[PDB]
Design a binder for this molecule. Structure first.
Ligand SMILES: Cc1cc2nc3c(=O)[nH]c(=O)nc-3n(C[C@H](O)[C@H](O)[C@H](O)COP(=O)(O)O)c2cc1C
Ligand SMILES: Cc1cc2nc3c(=O)[nH]c(=O)nc-3n(C[C@H](O)[C@H](O)[C@H](O)COP(=O)(O)O)c2cc1C
Lengths: 105, 106
């Protein structure tokens, strides 16, 4: 089952919702991720160029997919097949961001 | 500010998350809608043909936009510019549905 993260659109995109699979994949409970930017999932061997591509896509509200090294709560590395998309209203305003995570380790 | 609803993808799409704007637009608190299908927003003057188009689009996991008559918790009608889209993983599996609501009554 694929993980899902929903964030606010503005400020530093704090997490507002995660599904059950997110907790299975990452080892984090909803309570200890809500209100935080998802970058806490990154660690020492995370590719800086990949992070920079995500940063630019989110700033521009462009859809992007990356295979990125992430870390479970316990510190074990896993490969995250990550896809991020903006959620827009009819006038094109960004209402939220949705991220979908697949463990492809 | 536009409302947002997230639902599970299967078994009649129970609500799993709503944003603050959803409560402002509809008059329902998150506690009053979690675990329920969003169709409680509909009422007697809601256009049946519009509801049918939503039902067929959601069953097929196809994005859909409709202007639909909805009802606040207290019964006040409002026009809802509603956009529903499936959230897919890279294998094409539907993970969730996302709905965006704009009150266009004015
Ligand atoms: C909805 C959403 C979900 C995200 N999910 C992840 C994730 O699962 N893993 C990850 O490493 N980064 C994820 N990110 C990206 C980070 O939150 C952040 O945007 C990225 O590291 C680039 O920004 P920074 O340079 O400020 O860290 C997600 C971002 C958004 C908006
Ligand atoms: C994510 C999502 C959000 C929805 N939001 C609304 C809404 O704001 N107003 C509404 O009348 N119906 C909304 N619906 C549609 C109903 O939940 C239902 O799918 C529709 O009425 C057709 O099904 P039915 O014939 O079983 O009622 C939404 C559906 C989904 C999946």
């Amino acid at each position: 089952a694929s993980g899902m993260i929903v964030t606010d659109p503005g400020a530093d995109q704090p997490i507002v919702f995660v599904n059950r699979a997110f907790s299975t994949i990452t080892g984090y409970a909803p309570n200890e991720v809500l209100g935080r930017n998802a970058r806490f999932l990154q660690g020492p061997q995370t590719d800086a160029a990949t992070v920079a591509r995500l940063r630019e896509a989110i700033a521009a509200a462009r859809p992007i997919q990356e295979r990125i090294l992430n870390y479970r709560k316990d510190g074990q590395p896993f490969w995250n097949q990550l896809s991020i998309s903006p959620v827009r209203d009819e006038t094109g305003n960004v209402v939220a961001f949705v991220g979908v995570q697949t463990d492809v380790t």
